[PDB]
Curated annotation (Swiss-Prot):
The active site is at 87, 278, 297. Keywords: Acyltransferase, Signal, Transferase, Zymogen. One of its GO terms (molecular function) is protein-glutamine gamma-glutamyltransferase activity. Residues 26-41, 233-245 have a biased composition (Basic and acidic residues). Its EC number is 2.3.2.13. It comes from the Bacteria. It catalyses: L-glutaminyl-[protein] + L-lysyl-[protein] = [protein]-L-lysyl-N(6)-5-L-glutamyl-[protein] + NH4(+). This is Protein-glutamine gamma-glutamyltransferase.
Length: 354
C-alpha cells in the first residue's frame, strides 16, 4: 500500500530529516506557550480521524489531559519540546519518558505463515525475499495483539490495586497469572514483564508513585516499525523484511524489542524513501470495542517555517491506526505505567473539539 511519504507528500529531504531526528536523542521548533485561558479552536473527525495543528493541540491537552490531582496546568517548556519531535512526542509527553518499548506484545499466526510459505507462491514479478517478507507481515494480527496487551494490562492493574510496595504487587501478579494458567507467570525476575513497574521513573518519585504500586496505572501505546534493520546483512532483508525478526514468543505474546534500532526500510526504488517509525498513544480507555478506541499521533516533527511544515496531531480510530503504511511491517503493543494522579490516559478520549 501507500508509503508515509506518498500519503503526506513528504520529499526525500523531508524523509531524511525525519529519520535523522528520530535516530537522535529544516530545524525542529519548540511551539510557544499557550495561555490556559485560550480555548482550543473547534475541529472535527472525518472518516475516522481528527487532526489539528500542534499549537491548537497544546490548548486541548491543557484543558483536558494536563490535570494533576484534578487540576489543569500549562504544558511546560520541556513538555512542548518533547511534543515537537512529532510521531514520538505525544507518547513521550503523556508517559513522561522517552519510549523504551521494553514490554511489548503482538499476535502472530504461525500456522498461516508456514502454510502460505509452503502451499503459496510468489506473485508474478515478486522476488523470494519480497514474498517471504510480505507473508510474515500479513501473518500478524494487530487487533489480537492490542487485545493481548489490554488483557495483560488489566491483570497488571488488578495486581497493583491494593498493593503498597513492589513485593505485594509482584505477589498479587504471580497469584493472578498462576490462577489464569498464563505463560507469563514463568518470566524471569529480571524480565521486561516483571520489571516494568520498578523500571518506570515516576514509580520512584515522591511526587509520582512514591514506591507505592497502588498510585500507578498501566497504559498502552503502539509502535509501528521495520523488521529488517541489520545494515550488516543482506540488502534483501533491508528492502523487503526479515521474516524471522520481531515475532512474539508463542506462549506469552512477548516481543523482544532489544534489536530495534530505529532504522528505516531501505528504498525499493531510487528517490522513494521510508520513515523509520510511527507511535500511537492509546492510554487507558475503557471502551471495550477496539474499533471505537482513539489513537493519538503527530504527523512529523514541528517545522512551521520550513518544508516539513507545522506538526499536526492526529486522533485516529483504531482501524485508521492499524492500517499502517508500506514503511512498516511490524507493530508492537507496549505496556508502561504512569501515576494515577495524571490525566494523560483518561477513561474516554474524544476526537476533535466542539
Amino acid at each position: 500500500t501507500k508509503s508515509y511519504a506518498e500519503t503526506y507528500r513528504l520529499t526525500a529531504d523531508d524523509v531524511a530529516n525525519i529519520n535523522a531526528l528520530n535516530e537522535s536523542a529544516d530545524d525542529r521548533v519548540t511551539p510557544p506557550a499557550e495561555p490556559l485561558d485560550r480555548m482550543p479552536d473547534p475541529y472535527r473527525p472525518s472518516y475516522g480521524r481528527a487532526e489539528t495543528v500542534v499549537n491548537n493541540y497544546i490548548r486541548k491537552w491543557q484543558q483536558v489531559y494536563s490535570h494533576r490531582d484534578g487540576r489543569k496546568q500549562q504544558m511546560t517548556e520541556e513538555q512542548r519540546e518533547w511534543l515537537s519531535y512529532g510521531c514520538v512526542g505525544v507518547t513521550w509527553v503523556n508517559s513522561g519518558q522517552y519510549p523504551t518499548n521494553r514490554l511489548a506484545f503482538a499476535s502472530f499466526d504461525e500456522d498461516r505463515f508456514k502454510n502460505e510459505l509452503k502451499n503459496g507462491r510468489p506473485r508474478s514479478g515478486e522476488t523470494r525475499a519480497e514474498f517471504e517478507g510480505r507473508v510474515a507481515k500479513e501473518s500478524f494480527d494487530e487487533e489480537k495483539g492490542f487485545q493481548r496487551a489490554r488483557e495483560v494490562a488489566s491483570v497488571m492493574n488488578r495486581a497493583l490495586e491494593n498493593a503498597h510496595d513492589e513485593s505485594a504487587y509482584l505477589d498479587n501478579l504471580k497469584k493472578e497469572l498462576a490462577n489464569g494458567n498464563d505463560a507469563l507467570r514463568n518470566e524471569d525476575a529480571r524480565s521486561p514483564f516483571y520489571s516494568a513497574l520498578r523500571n518506570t521513573p515516576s514509580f520512584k518519585e515522591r511526587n509520582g508513585g512514591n514506591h507505592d504500586p497502588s498510585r500507578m496505572k498501566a497504559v498502552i501505546y503502539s509502535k509501528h516499525f521495520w523488521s529488517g534493520q541489520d545494515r550488516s546483512s543482506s540488502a534483501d532483508k533491508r528492502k523487503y523484511g526479515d521474516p524471522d525478526a520481531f515475532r512474539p514468543a508463542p506462549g506469552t505474546g512477548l516481543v523482544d524489542m532489544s534489536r530495534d534500532r530505529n532504522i528505516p526500510r531501505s528504498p525499493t526504488s531510487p528517490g522513494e524513501g521510508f520513515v523509520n517509525f510511527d507511535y500511537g498513544w492509546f492510554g487507558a480507555q475503557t471502551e471495550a470495542d477496539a474499533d471505537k478506541t482513539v489513537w493519538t499521533h503527530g504527523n512529523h516533527y514541528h517545522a512551521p517555517n520550513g518544508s516539513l511544515g507545522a506538526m499536526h496531531v492526529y486522533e485516529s480510530k483504531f482501524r485508521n491506526w492499524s492500517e499502517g503504511y508500506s514503511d512498516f511491517d511490524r507493530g508492537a503493543y507496549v505496556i508502561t505505567f504512569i501515576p494515577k494522579s495524571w490525566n494523560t490516559a483518561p477513561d474516554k478520549v474524544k476526537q476533535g473539539w466542539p
